[PDB]
Short mmCIF file of all heavy atoms in Angstrom, two decimals:
data_model
loop_
_atom_site.label_atom_id
_atom_site.label_comp_id
_atom_site.label_asym_id
_atom_site.label_seq_id
_atom_site.Cartn_x
_atom_site.Cartn_y
_atom_site.Cartn_z
N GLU A 34 12.40 -6.36 6.41
CA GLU A 34 12.36 -7.65 5.80
C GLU A 34 13.32 -7.75 4.69
O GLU A 34 13.49 -8.91 4.07
CB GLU A 34 10.96 -7.96 5.24
CG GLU A 34 9.95 -8.26 6.41
CD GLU A 34 10.39 -9.22 7.48
OE1 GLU A 34 10.91 -10.34 7.11
OE2 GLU A 34 10.14 -9.05 8.60
N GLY A 35 14.01 -6.68 4.31
CA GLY A 35 15.12 -6.83 3.26
C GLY A 35 14.60 -6.86 1.89
O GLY A 35 15.51 -6.93 0.95
N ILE A 36 13.39 -6.75 1.55
CA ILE A 36 12.93 -6.86 0.18
C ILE A 36 12.94 -5.41 -0.54
O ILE A 36 12.30 -4.50 0.06
CB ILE A 36 11.42 -7.37 0.11
CG1 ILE A 36 11.23 -8.62 0.87
CG2 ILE A 36 11.03 -7.40 -1.32
CD1 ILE A 36 9.77 -8.74 1.46
N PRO A 37 13.75 -5.32 -1.61
CA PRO A 37 13.87 -3.96 -2.14
C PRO A 37 12.48 -3.41 -2.72
O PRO A 37 11.78 -4.25 -3.22
CB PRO A 37 14.84 -4.30 -3.33
CG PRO A 37 15.40 -5.60 -3.22
CD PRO A 37 14.42 -6.38 -2.32
N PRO A 38 12.36 -2.19 -2.58
CA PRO A 38 11.05 -1.62 -2.85
C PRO A 38 10.63 -1.85 -4.29
O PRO A 38 9.40 -1.85 -4.52
CB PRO A 38 11.21 -0.11 -2.58
CG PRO A 38 12.18 -0.15 -1.51
CD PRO A 38 13.15 -1.20 -1.75
N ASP A 39 11.58 -1.89 -5.26
CA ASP A 39 11.14 -2.03 -6.64
C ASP A 39 10.49 -3.31 -6.95
O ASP A 39 9.80 -3.51 -7.97
CB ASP A 39 12.33 -1.80 -7.64
CG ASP A 39 13.43 -2.80 -7.52
OD1 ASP A 39 13.80 -3.26 -6.37
OD2 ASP A 39 14.09 -3.18 -8.51
N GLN A 40 10.75 -4.36 -6.01
CA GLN A 40 10.17 -5.67 -6.12
C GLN A 40 8.83 -5.75 -5.42
O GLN A 40 8.19 -6.85 -5.52
CB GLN A 40 11.20 -6.73 -5.69
CG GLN A 40 12.44 -6.71 -6.39
CD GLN A 40 13.38 -7.83 -5.93
OE1 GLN A 40 12.86 -8.73 -5.16
NE2 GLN A 40 14.67 -7.74 -6.32
N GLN A 41 8.42 -4.83 -4.65
CA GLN A 41 7.23 -4.81 -3.91
C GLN A 41 6.04 -4.36 -4.50
O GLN A 41 6.10 -3.28 -5.19
CB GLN A 41 7.43 -3.97 -2.62
CG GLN A 41 8.49 -4.57 -1.67
CD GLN A 41 8.61 -3.62 -0.41
OE1 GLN A 41 7.48 -3.12 0.20
NE2 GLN A 41 9.75 -3.38 0.08
N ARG A 42 4.90 -5.06 -4.41
CA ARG A 42 3.57 -4.56 -4.71
C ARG A 42 2.61 -4.66 -3.59
O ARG A 42 2.53 -5.83 -3.01
CB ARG A 42 3.04 -5.34 -5.94
CG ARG A 42 1.59 -4.88 -6.38
CD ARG A 42 0.79 -6.01 -7.17
NE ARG A 42 1.59 -6.56 -8.32
CZ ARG A 42 1.16 -6.27 -9.56
NH1 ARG A 42 0.17 -5.50 -9.89
NH2 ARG A 42 1.91 -6.78 -10.61
N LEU A 43 2.02 -3.60 -3.06
CA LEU A 43 1.20 -3.66 -1.94
C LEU A 43 -0.28 -3.54 -2.35
O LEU A 43 -0.66 -2.94 -3.38
CB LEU A 43 1.48 -2.48 -1.03
CG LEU A 43 2.83 -2.50 -0.22
CD1 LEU A 43 3.03 -1.16 0.55
CD2 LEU A 43 2.71 -3.69 0.78
N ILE A 44 -1.05 -4.32 -1.71
CA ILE A 44 -2.51 -4.49 -2.14
C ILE A 44 -3.38 -4.20 -0.87
O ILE A 44 -3.07 -4.71 0.21
CB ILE A 44 -2.80 -5.93 -2.66
CG1 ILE A 44 -2.00 -6.10 -4.06
CG2 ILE A 44 -4.27 -6.00 -3.02
CD1 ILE A 44 -2.12 -7.54 -4.58
N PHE A 45 -4.39 -3.33 -1.08
CA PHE A 45 -5.32 -3.16 -0.02
C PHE A 45 -6.63 -2.98 -0.61
O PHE A 45 -6.92 -2.23 -1.60
CB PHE A 45 -4.99 -1.79 0.76
CG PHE A 45 -5.99 -1.37 1.78
CD1 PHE A 45 -6.10 -2.09 2.95
CD2 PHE A 45 -6.86 -0.21 1.58
CE1 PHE A 45 -6.99 -1.75 3.98
CE2 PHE A 45 -7.76 0.16 2.55
CZ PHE A 45 -7.80 -0.58 3.73
N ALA A 46 -7.63 -3.81 0.01
CA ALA A 46 -9.04 -3.70 -0.47
C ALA A 46 -9.19 -3.93 -1.92
O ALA A 46 -9.94 -3.22 -2.70
CB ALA A 46 -9.58 -2.34 -0.03
N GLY A 47 -8.40 -4.80 -2.42
CA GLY A 47 -8.51 -5.10 -3.91
C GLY A 47 -7.75 -4.28 -4.95
O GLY A 47 -7.96 -4.40 -6.13
N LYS A 48 -7.06 -3.08 -4.40
CA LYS A 48 -6.36 -2.22 -5.32
C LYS A 48 -4.83 -2.30 -5.07
O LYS A 48 -4.38 -2.47 -3.81
CB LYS A 48 -6.65 -0.78 -4.77
CG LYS A 48 -8.15 -0.33 -5.37
CD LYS A 48 -8.36 1.10 -4.89
CE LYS A 48 -9.73 1.40 -5.36
NZ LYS A 48 -9.72 1.65 -6.85
N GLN A 49 -4.07 -2.25 -6.08
CA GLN A 49 -2.68 -2.10 -5.93
C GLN A 49 -2.44 -0.59 -5.49
O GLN A 49 -2.99 0.30 -5.99
CB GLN A 49 -2.02 -2.32 -7.25
CG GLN A 49 -0.41 -1.98 -7.25
CD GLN A 49 0.20 -1.88 -8.54
OE1 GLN A 49 0.16 -1.01 -9.28
NE2 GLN A 49 0.86 -3.00 -8.98
N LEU A 50 -1.55 -0.34 -4.59
CA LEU A 50 -1.24 0.90 -4.03
C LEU A 50 -0.27 1.53 -4.95
O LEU A 50 1.02 1.10 -5.07
CB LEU A 50 -0.88 0.86 -2.64
CG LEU A 50 -1.80 0.05 -1.74
CD1 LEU A 50 -1.30 0.08 -0.22
CD2 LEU A 50 -3.21 0.66 -1.84
N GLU A 51 -0.42 2.74 -5.52
CA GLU A 51 0.44 3.32 -6.46
C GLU A 51 1.44 4.10 -5.62
O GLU A 51 1.21 4.84 -4.64
CB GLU A 51 -0.33 4.19 -7.49
CG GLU A 51 -1.55 3.52 -8.31
CD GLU A 51 -1.00 2.47 -9.28
OE1 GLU A 51 0.24 2.17 -9.49
OE2 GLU A 51 -1.84 1.88 -9.98
N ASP A 52 2.66 4.00 -6.11
CA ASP A 52 3.68 4.95 -5.78
C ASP A 52 3.30 6.33 -6.21
O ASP A 52 2.66 6.63 -7.13
CB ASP A 52 5.16 4.55 -6.38
CG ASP A 52 5.74 3.28 -6.08
OD1 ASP A 52 5.44 2.64 -4.97
OD2 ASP A 52 6.40 2.64 -6.93
N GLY A 53 3.77 7.24 -5.28
CA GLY A 53 3.36 8.57 -5.42
C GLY A 53 2.12 8.99 -4.60
O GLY A 53 1.88 10.14 -4.32
N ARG A 54 1.36 7.93 -4.33
CA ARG A 54 0.01 8.27 -3.48
C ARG A 54 0.42 8.01 -1.99
O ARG A 54 1.50 7.54 -1.65
CB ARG A 54 -1.04 7.50 -4.03
CG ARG A 54 -1.28 8.00 -5.55
CD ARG A 54 -2.49 7.36 -6.17
NE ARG A 54 -3.78 7.82 -5.60
CZ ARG A 54 -4.29 8.91 -5.72
NH1 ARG A 54 -3.77 9.98 -6.37
NH2 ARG A 54 -5.58 9.12 -5.17
N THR A 55 -0.49 8.40 -1.15
CA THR A 55 -0.41 8.27 0.25
C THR A 55 -1.31 7.28 0.80
O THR A 55 -2.28 6.84 0.13
CB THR A 55 -0.55 9.58 0.96
OG1 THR A 55 -1.94 9.94 0.83
CG2 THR A 55 0.35 10.65 0.40
N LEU A 56 -1.02 6.78 2.11
CA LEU A 56 -1.96 5.98 2.81
C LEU A 56 -3.36 6.64 2.87
O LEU A 56 -4.35 5.98 2.73
CB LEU A 56 -1.53 5.73 4.21
CG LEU A 56 -0.11 4.75 4.24
CD1 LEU A 56 0.33 4.64 5.65
CD2 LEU A 56 -0.43 3.44 3.63
N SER A 57 -3.33 7.94 3.19
CA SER A 57 -4.68 8.66 3.13
C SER A 57 -5.43 8.60 1.88
O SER A 57 -6.67 8.65 1.90
CB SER A 57 -4.45 10.04 3.73
OG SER A 57 -3.57 10.70 2.92
N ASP A 58 -4.58 8.53 0.75
CA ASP A 58 -5.34 8.44 -0.50
C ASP A 58 -6.22 7.27 -0.60
O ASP A 58 -7.26 7.23 -1.28
CB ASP A 58 -4.34 8.57 -1.58
CG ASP A 58 -3.82 10.00 -1.81
OD1 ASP A 58 -4.58 10.92 -1.54
OD2 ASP A 58 -2.65 10.17 -2.41
N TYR A 59 -5.80 6.16 -0.03
CA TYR A 59 -6.54 4.94 -0.04
C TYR A 59 -7.50 4.71 1.18
O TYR A 59 -8.01 3.67 1.36
CB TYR A 59 -5.56 3.75 -0.23
CG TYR A 59 -4.88 3.82 -1.61
CD1 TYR A 59 -3.59 4.35 -1.83
CD2 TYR A 59 -5.63 3.28 -2.82
CE1 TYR A 59 -2.93 4.32 -3.01
CE2 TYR A 59 -4.94 3.43 -3.96
CZ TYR A 59 -3.65 3.93 -4.16
OH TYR A 59 -3.26 3.93 -5.53
N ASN A 60 -7.52 5.72 2.01
CA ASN A 60 -8.26 5.58 3.27
C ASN A 60 -7.73 4.43 4.15
O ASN A 60 -8.55 3.74 4.83
CB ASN A 60 -9.78 5.47 3.05
CG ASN A 60 -10.60 5.93 4.31
OD1 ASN A 60 -10.11 6.76 5.10
ND2 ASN A 60 -11.78 5.51 4.48
N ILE A 61 -6.43 4.29 4.09
CA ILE A 61 -5.81 3.30 4.98
C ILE A 61 -5.73 3.92 6.38
O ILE A 61 -4.95 4.78 6.66
CB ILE A 61 -4.46 2.79 4.56
CG1 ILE A 61 -4.80 2.06 3.18
CG2 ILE A 61 -3.68 2.00 5.60
CD1 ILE A 61 -3.49 1.86 2.33
N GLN A 62 -6.65 3.42 7.32
CA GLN A 62 -6.60 3.95 8.69
C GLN A 62 -5.89 3.09 9.65
O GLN A 62 -5.41 1.92 9.24
CB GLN A 62 -8.12 4.14 9.11
CG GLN A 62 -8.76 5.07 8.08
CD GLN A 62 -10.14 5.48 8.65
OE1 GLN A 62 -10.60 5.03 9.75
NE2 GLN A 62 -10.77 6.42 8.06
N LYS A 63 -5.81 3.43 10.93
CA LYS A 63 -5.04 2.67 11.92
C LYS A 63 -5.65 1.31 12.00
O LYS A 63 -6.85 1.02 11.87
CB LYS A 63 -5.09 3.40 13.33
CG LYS A 63 -6.47 3.49 13.76
CD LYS A 63 -6.58 4.15 15.17
CE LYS A 63 -7.84 4.13 15.83
NZ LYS A 63 -7.89 4.66 17.17
N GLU A 64 -4.71 0.27 12.05
CA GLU A 64 -4.88 -1.15 12.28
C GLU A 64 -5.45 -1.81 10.91
O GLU A 64 -5.91 -2.89 11.05
CB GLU A 64 -5.86 -1.40 13.32
CG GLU A 64 -5.60 -0.65 14.60
CD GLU A 64 -4.39 -1.03 15.38
OE1 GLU A 64 -3.62 -2.15 14.92
OE2 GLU A 64 -3.89 -0.33 16.37
N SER A 65 -5.24 -1.12 9.74
CA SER A 65 -5.59 -1.72 8.50
C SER A 65 -4.56 -2.79 8.29
O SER A 65 -3.41 -2.72 8.68
CB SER A 65 -5.60 -0.56 7.36
OG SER A 65 -6.60 0.29 7.57
N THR A 66 -4.91 -3.75 7.43
CA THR A 66 -3.89 -4.83 6.90
C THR A 66 -3.71 -4.64 5.47
O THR A 66 -4.73 -4.58 4.70
CB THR A 66 -4.40 -6.23 7.30
OG1 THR A 66 -4.57 -6.22 8.64
CG2 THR A 66 -3.29 -7.17 6.80
N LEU A 67 -2.46 -4.45 4.96
CA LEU A 67 -2.09 -4.54 3.59
C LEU A 67 -1.51 -5.92 3.23
O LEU A 67 -0.97 -6.64 4.19
CB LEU A 67 -0.97 -3.46 3.27
CG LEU A 67 -1.15 -2.07 3.87
CD1 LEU A 67 -0.07 -1.13 3.35
CD2 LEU A 67 -2.54 -1.52 3.39
#
């Protein structure tokens, strides 16, 4: 989509996803929506 990563904030289940952490740290499983 061309959006530079420093401009992106991803949200899952009401939490901002921190850089440095992984998908598994937030229990983001297959077919989850961010």
